Design a protein around this nucleic acid. Structure first.
Lengths: 64, 62
DNA sequence: TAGGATTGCGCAATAT
DNA sequence: AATATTGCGCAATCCT
């Protein structure tokens, strides 16, 4: 049938579009993980640096 | 054909398994985002807390 | 009721 | 030989 073919073709085009977006969304999510992981490492270093800074300062005052 | 029957039966199982595996991997990656986002917020608050404590202590210098 | 978007699945060629 | 992967596509259901 001609009508049939037309209707199927439209959905097949829609399907490829939907799959492309989902796969792209996936790639984006993966990039987000790399970004968040980098930020996590930065924050961890910051927390450790400040914690040591604070600990040393507290020790000094305690000596008073 | 019986050989065709088992062929399709086994491949449909493998296809579904392969696709579920890919879906799980994607769902997992999505969980990492929610997980890293929450943790980063927690560490950021910790950074702010630590900075406030340092500031408080140093004021005692005056 | 119409039509695109989303989802799960089947098939068959092909990769492992 | 058998399982894993994937382009093409069907059909049901979701959503606007």
């Amino acid at each position: 049938s001609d009508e049939y073919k037309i209707r199927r073709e439209r959905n097949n085009i829609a399907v490829r579009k939907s799959r492309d977006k989902a796969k792209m969304r996936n790639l984006e999510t993966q990039h987000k993980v790399l970004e968040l992981t980098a930020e996590n490492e930065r924050l961890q270093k910051k927390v450790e640096q400040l914690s040591r800074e604070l600990s040393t300062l507290r020790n000094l005052f305690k000596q008073l």
